Amino acid sequence: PAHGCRHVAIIMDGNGRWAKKQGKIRAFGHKAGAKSVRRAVSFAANNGIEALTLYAFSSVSALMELFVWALDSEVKSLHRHNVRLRIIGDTSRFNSRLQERIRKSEALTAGNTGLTLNIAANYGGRWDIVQGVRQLAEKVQQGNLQPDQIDEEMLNQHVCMHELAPVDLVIRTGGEHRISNFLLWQIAYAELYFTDVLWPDFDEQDFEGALNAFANRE
Amino acid sequence: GCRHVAIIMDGNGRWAKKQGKIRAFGHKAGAKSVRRAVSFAANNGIEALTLYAFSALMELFVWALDSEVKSLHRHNVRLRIIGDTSRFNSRLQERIRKSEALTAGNTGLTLNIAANYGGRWDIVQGVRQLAEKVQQGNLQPDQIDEEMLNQHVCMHELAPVDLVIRTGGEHRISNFLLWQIAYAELYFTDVLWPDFDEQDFEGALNAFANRERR
Numbered sequence A: 001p002a003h004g005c006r007h008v009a010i011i012m013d014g015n016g017r018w019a020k021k022q023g024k025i026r027a028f029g030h031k032a033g034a035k036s037v038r039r040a041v042s043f044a045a046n047n048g049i050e051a052l053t054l055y056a057f058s059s060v061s062a063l064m065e066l067f068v069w070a071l072d073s074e075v076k077s078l079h080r081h082n083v084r085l086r087i088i089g090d091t092s093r094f095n096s097r098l099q100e101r102i103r104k105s106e107a108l109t110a111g112n113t114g115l116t117l118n119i120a121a122n123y124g125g126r127w128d129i130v131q132g133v134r135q136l137a138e139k140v141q142q143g144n145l146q147p148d149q150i151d152e153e154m155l156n157q158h159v160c161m162h163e164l165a166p167v168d169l170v171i172r173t174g175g176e177h178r179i180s181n182f183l184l185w186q187i188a189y190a191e192l193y194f195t196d197v198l199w200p201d202f203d204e205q206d207f208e209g210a211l212n213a214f215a216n217r218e
Numbered sequence B: 001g002c003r004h005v006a007i008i009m010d011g012n013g014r015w016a017k018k019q020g021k022i023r024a025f026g027h028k029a030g031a032k033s034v035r036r037a038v039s040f041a042a043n044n045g046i047e048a049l050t051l052y053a054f055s056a057l058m059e060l061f062v063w064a065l066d067s068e069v070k071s072l073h074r075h076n077v078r079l080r081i082i083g084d085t086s087r088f089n090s091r092l093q094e095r096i097r098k099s100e101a102l103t104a105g106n107t108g109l110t111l112n113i114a115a116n117y118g119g120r121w122d123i124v125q126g127v128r129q130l131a132e133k134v135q136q137g138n139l140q141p142d143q144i145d146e147e148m149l150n151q152h153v154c155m156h157e158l159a160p161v162d163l164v165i166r167t168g169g170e171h172r173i174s175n176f177l178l179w180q181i182a183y184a185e186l187y188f189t190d191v192l193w194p195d196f197d198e199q200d201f202e203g204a205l206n207a208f209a210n211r212e213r214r
């Protein structure tokens, strides 16, 4: 599309600060944050973005259960919106019901032709590089791979989201200017966009602002 | 307290053109800004300063080493070059090795110059080392973890990078440090490298300080 942006990653932060400023509890901030997630996803779909990767930053094993569990009611709506869903992160420690649910959801939306929405859950950028590395170590132990044949491009095939367009833009709301171990390998050439807007208030116009920044930046 | 600053020095050529001068002029001013930045870091107890030049130079590299290494040593600065130097000519490689050997025991600022460096390359050199230990048999694929990999990436022996500064206007890491900046504060300034001075540097350090608090 015109903005030249195919894949956007967002570090969502500030829901709690937002609530507290309103004199409200964290639950209120979560309702507002989900509403902002729904709006950012439709915005992305309606604007020709191919992939949207979302990371919720928290101001632990159970939390990442709730989080991904909530996303369950959302699956049907997402499917109906022709969105392809994927969960990225270490879910190897999640009970196998979730892992099946997760794979059902991924199976279900797998053939949709709209926005590919990647949701981070128990994700870490270093972990991501590590699992890809383990995968190369296996091929070594099997005598199929020679250490010296290992290059960037090869490791690149084993990190999360290798099959999607490379990340063009990473937006971080909430005021902090750090990656906080979200994508690392994948952001080597991405435009980085930091805004003080808290996630609950980040809307279509804020998203347009980031895309135009990227459009003119490149 | 900011212990290790990494800087993506960008803007020399664009700067030259603004003055109506040739590229070589920007370089000259570029190198003076490096001198000033390194003095500033040493002058303020920063443990490590890592410099990445973002874009013959092999002979000039020999010259920067032969000419400045003596002063850095006198300033108790420990010098290290990071990146792929395996293909530079052997004389430059030797010069790099001696300069490093000469200042290795210094205890002041450790100045890391990234030459022919890339963040992905850096992670891959570490991976290859770990693959060797697997091929041999003294490492099980699933024994590999974050800590282990971290022990084979450049600068693992130094304080973790706290602040990455990119001058020149672009808002990208451009395949500079990747594994190492997972928790680093990122500071972008439109100031062109030749104009980046003590005040600009402190501004970034202040940003780090103030933000570290809030």
Ligand SMILES: O=P(O)(O)C(O)(Cc1cccc(-c2ccc(-c3ccccc3)cc2)c1)P(=O)(O)O
Residues within 6 Å of the ligand: A012, A013, A014, A015, A016, A017, A026, A029, A030, A031, A033, A034, A035, A037, A055, A056, A057, A058, A059, A070, A071, A074, A199
């Ligand atoms: O932004 P924070 O750090 O204040 C916090 O809300 C965590 C958080 C960050 C970003 C996004 C979200 C969030 C993302 C998604 C949803 C959501 C989405 C769909 C359905 C239900 C709930 C709710 C909340 C939560 P926390 O739980 O740490 O107060």
Ligand SMILES: O=P(O)(O)C(O)(Cc1cccc(-c2ccc(-c3ccccc3)cc2)c1)P(=O)(O)O
Residues within 6 Å of the ligand: A026, A027, A028, A030, A031, A056, A057, A058, A063, A064, A066, A067, A070
């Ligand atoms: O413990 P509860 O039942 O009070 C509540 O937190 C449940 C909840 C609803 C929506 C989202 C979340 C939630 C969102 C995000 C995260 C999270 C995100 C990133 C890292 C760690 C934790 C954890 C939990 C939790 P609620 O939103 O109803 O206050």
